[model samples]
Target: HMGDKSENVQDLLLLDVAPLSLGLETAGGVMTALIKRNSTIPTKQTQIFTTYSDNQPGVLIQVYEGERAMTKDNNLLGRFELSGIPPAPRGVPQIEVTFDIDANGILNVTATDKSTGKANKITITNDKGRLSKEEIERMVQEAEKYKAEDEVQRERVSAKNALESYAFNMKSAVEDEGLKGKISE
Candidate 1:
């Protein structure tokens, strides 16, 4: 709906648009944008997604917000489960996920399975939707931590002693610990 503005007697009009691209995680923790950044509010884009394995029972919808290619480099808005999907071969069962950003910048993350019997919905606000300053700080801090932890390679170990101390720590930091099995590692 477009209407002309006459610069009337007393008037106040305000409008807002999305600040950054919003997307969800799929295979390899890769993110695909649905509602891209700077779109007008009350906008939406629905994308059909599928499973990776044979007879996968459910989908864990991991929502993200950023311009990063990898979810690890982006902010996790939130996540939910659209479970109880009919266990069929990977490509056979499809799930349609929709992201609708209203005029108020609130979103309803809705997903529907093939049968349409199981539909799930969740909401997250712009407080986390926008990449806050703290978010970037945390990323840098974590990167520095990992860099410090990966100090083993720089120092050459002589063959006589043969054993490395922090090398084990590097393994613990990179491969062993953190939320590996819980969510997307």
Candidate 2:
């Protein structure tokens, strides 16, 4: 009944959002973002890719995350090569990359050769470059315990990057001003 309220309310339902953008390493080492970060759970996306070499019967599919433009600059999450593609000219055949995230926060990925129907799949669980559930929870606790120390470390890295950028620009300017002979490779 609408008037029934006696400390017996239903439990709340919680949901998980993607922590990072999921993408595949495409040609020229570029990252093609498939699923955007913070998207709701139980989501999926599919994309087609092609081989970059002629007579290539296999295609290597590399998965990554983060906001970087290049795959090498991003964090590599997983990888697998899909073989069994018929030999053909470059870009003749197509491969499909499918990403599926379940409600339990687990990810499943698959790569299929569209021409031959051969497929390879992987379940992204705690197996690949991931800390176990208990370990993650414990690490969260430890992070709060060492917050101040982490803050100092972060600043140190920031200053180091700033100096490196300055030095690089200065060297470029000196080279442009006919001082390249003084600098050794």
Candidate 3:
């Protein structure tokens, strides 16, 4: 059955896309993209990584989301260490990294060792970036009030600093000239 403009049918759906490229930090501080930007939501991607040293037992997995080529330039989503990996030479063991994003924008990351089947998982909620509705409203009001007080506070601070600097210079000059007792009087 099909509905037209006069059918009075209401249809609603939720859609989302990756705001930025999600990737893992690799050796040399490079970012290896797992889920690219604008990709449809509720998706998963996987990549295989290797250790950097001989007989390395674990690796630090750093996840970031941004368009930058360097991982340090992006926003760190989460990090975890995948320990218990079988000791092996560099590039001998395969570590599988997976990123899963749910419909509600929750990110889950997993690192698995191919050699030993050891795995570590992490869920990134971005709590640092969240604000309650009331907090947002209060912030808006504070911003409006702050603009009115900014100029007055700035001038007050400037005057205080100038006086402090003058006093310090005068004290130094008096001490150098051996006029400390005379100046205090």
Candidate 4:
């Protein structure tokens, strides 16, 4: 019914909180935050929006990721469109925007028009050159900047390697016929 030894490093937890805040650039250059910084991964936030002009057929959703108060102060991740709004006066369209951050720290922003049933989604990832503010500060601190940064890189790679090896070990064990039935017992 349960695994006595749940998993490799099960007792020790490693959390990948979001590196920065995530939101949209809205009216008056105001930065509306959908998700705050350091919020746990696999989180979701949704907000309903209305159009400023009558019969607005679409909306431009600008995505930004940073801690700044203004959109100009933050870095723009990307932008997407939410179209097919029903023709009506301003504030008539009901558009829902959902911002999500999965466990892998991938951003998925979805916009759906409730009345028209139209939808659009944008995906943003930190797959490359994904350095956090803390890491930058630490890496550039004191002299020997390059040396410190190199060590950080080494430690990150080693930890990743360790996890991969553990997964490989489990895969090997599962494939072994001798231990196949033993695992379930």
Candidate 2, which segments miss by more than 4 Å at Cα?
1-15, 86-90, 126-185
Q: Which residue pairs in candidate 2 have backbone atoms (N, alpha carbon, C) closer than 3 angstroms, thus clashing?
A: none
Segments of candidate 4 deviating more than 4 angstroms? 1-15, 54-56, 85-89, 127-185
- Give lDDT tens digits, candidate 2, residues 137-169: 443354344445434543543321110101111
Q: Predictions ranked by TM-score, top down? A: 1, 3, 4, 2
Residues 15-50, model 1: lDDT tens digits: 366555676754444445677666886677897775
Estimate, for each residue in 1-185, the C-alpha lDDT of model 4 and write its tens digit: 77586466523333466545566655433445577656877789997754443243446676665534333433456677655555542445566778977665467889786767778897887542234555434322421443344345434443211101011111122122465443553
TM-score of each: 0.57, 0.54, 0.55, 0.55
- lDDT value for candidate 2? 0.54
In model 1, the Cα lDDT at residue 134 comes to: 64
Task: State the lDDT at 179 in candidate 2.
Answer: 53
Score residue 64 of candidate 1 by CA lDDT: 70
Model 4 weakest lDDT span, ten residues long: 160-169
- Give the Cα error of residue 59 in candidate 1, in Å: 0.9
Per-residue error for 103 in candidate 4, Å, reads 2.2
Q: Each prediction's Cα lDDT score?
A: 0.56, 0.54, 0.55, 0.53
Going through the candidates in the order shown, the clash numbers are 1, 0, 0, 0
Listed per candidate, the RMSD to the true structure in angstroms reads 15.6, 17.5, 20.3, 18.5
Q: What TM-score should be assigned to candidate 3?
A: 0.55
